[model samples]
Target: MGKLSEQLKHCNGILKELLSKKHAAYAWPFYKPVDASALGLHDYHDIIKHPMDLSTVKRKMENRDYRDAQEFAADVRLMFSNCYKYNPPDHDVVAMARKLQDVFEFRYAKMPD
Candidate 1:
């Protein structure tokens, strides 16, 4: 019913749209850089059942001053969780994700009630 709520709805839509497509980055390391037909796996097969248009979103956030960090985090987590449906990430992916968090200084601490 409010502006922040509407932005969150659109964010949800963008995330879901991206996830419904095959994620090229999803299963990168396990397959030796190519699809193994014998392994019953094809390149571009993981239908990430969630996120980008990143530049647009970032622009909107800047313009709207969308400081509702909780809503932003919710959409981010949704994007990550849905894309990892069947393929558990390998060590490299996990490591890179951690590094990325560090790059942004994203520390996790408890939020107050």
Candidate 2:
């Protein structure tokens, strides 16, 4: 594979690994986009301009929308950032987002050059 392809493969592999852990106590909320209206978080969209989610990132990966792994990482990170922005510091989901962010960063740093 070319360098870009290799990078993308590495990212997808790590993301797939993260998603497979359905047992991850903090993973469910990230699997899909937030349903602001459904959840009655009326101000959600106002607070978060660039909302992101794991499934959306996965879909982008499947479409080869990312130019490279860096792009993929940006979107992944954005998902967590959006969570942090919308939730209070002590919110359970904020803590969950932090945990997942750490995992993603650790794996991302190990990606091949």
Q: Pick the candidate with the highest TM-score.
A: 2
Give the candidate number with the greatest lDDT: 2
Predicted candidate 2 versus true structure: per-residue lDDT over 54-95, tens digit per residue: 899999999989999989999998998899888889999998
Tens-digit lDDT string for candidate 1 (16-102) = 433333432542332132233665755434554233223433554557545564655554444334334434577455543443333
Q: How accurate locally is residue 16 in candidate 1, as Cα lDDT from 0 to 100?
A: 41
Q: Rate the local accuracy (lDDT) of all candidates.
A: 0.42, 0.89
Evaluate model 1: give its lDDT: 0.42
Clashing pairs in 1: 19-50
Give candidates' CA RMSD values in order.
10.3, 1.1
The list of candidate 2 runs beyond 4 A from truth reads none
